[PDB]
């Protein structure tokens, strides 16, 4: 019974959302078979680039965002999992189920978003398809969608950033306020909460 008992896989970086051009676009960097292998070994020799990663477990694909040298994502996606890296699986540096937040040391080669300092309530949610969706900040951790969307559209984008007009980080997207499967607002983890965790 115990020999049959295996550990859960690592989170695996399988792509990125490229935001450093004049265009936003998703890039896949690992296909399904590579992802499965890498989840088991915890050894990812790909060179990571950029700020927003697309990540997968065996059951979910979602996003992760580097801010202040830490790659952050949602606990409801990653749980307590290690992340695959060049030298093997990396244990989380931060874990907080109550905030729905986890983080690992940012991968070598990655870059971090700068926390927002401009005070803007005009926000932009970056999805896993590299859609840039306007969100009006309404409070510490909430913003309204200018256009309603099905919740299914936003599924898989938790862990991604809310950006201010200058492209600086305001928070990490985690959940949508929905009625009858239609999202009208988003819930996010503010960057100030990440700094408190650190």
């Amino acid at each position: 019974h115990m020999a049959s008992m295996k550990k859960k896989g690592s989170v695996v970086i399988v792509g990125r959302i490229n935001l450093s051009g004049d265009t936003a676009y998703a890039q896949q960097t690992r296909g399904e078979e590579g992802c499965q292998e890498t989840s088991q070994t915890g050894r990812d020799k790909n060179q990571v680039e950029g700020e927003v990663q697309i990540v997968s477990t065996a059951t979910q694909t979602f996003l992760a965002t580097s801010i202040n040298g830490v790659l952050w994502t949602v606990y409801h996606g990653a749980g307590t999992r290690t992340i695959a890296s060049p030298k093997g699986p990396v244990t989380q540096m931060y874990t907080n189920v109550d905030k729905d937040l986890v983080g690992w040391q940012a991968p070598q080669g990655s870059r971090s978003l700068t926390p927002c300092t401009c005070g803007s309530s005009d926000l932009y949610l970056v999805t896993r398809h590299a859609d840039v969706i306007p969100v009006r900040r309404r409070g510490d951790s909430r913003g309204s969608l200018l256009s309603p969307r099905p919740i299914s559209y936003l599924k898989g984008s938790a862990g991604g950033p809310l950006l201010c007009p200058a492209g600086h980080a305001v928070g990490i997207f985690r959940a949508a306020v929905s009625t009858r499967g239609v999202a009208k607002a988003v819930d996010f983890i503010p960057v100030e909460s990440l700094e408190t965790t650190m």
């Binding site: 409801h76 959940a175 949508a176 306020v177 819930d187």
Partner: peptide, 7 residues
């Protein structure tokens, strides 16, 4: 009924 749905 509004609810917060994890994404």
């Amino acid at each position: 009924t509004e609810d917060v749905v994890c994404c």
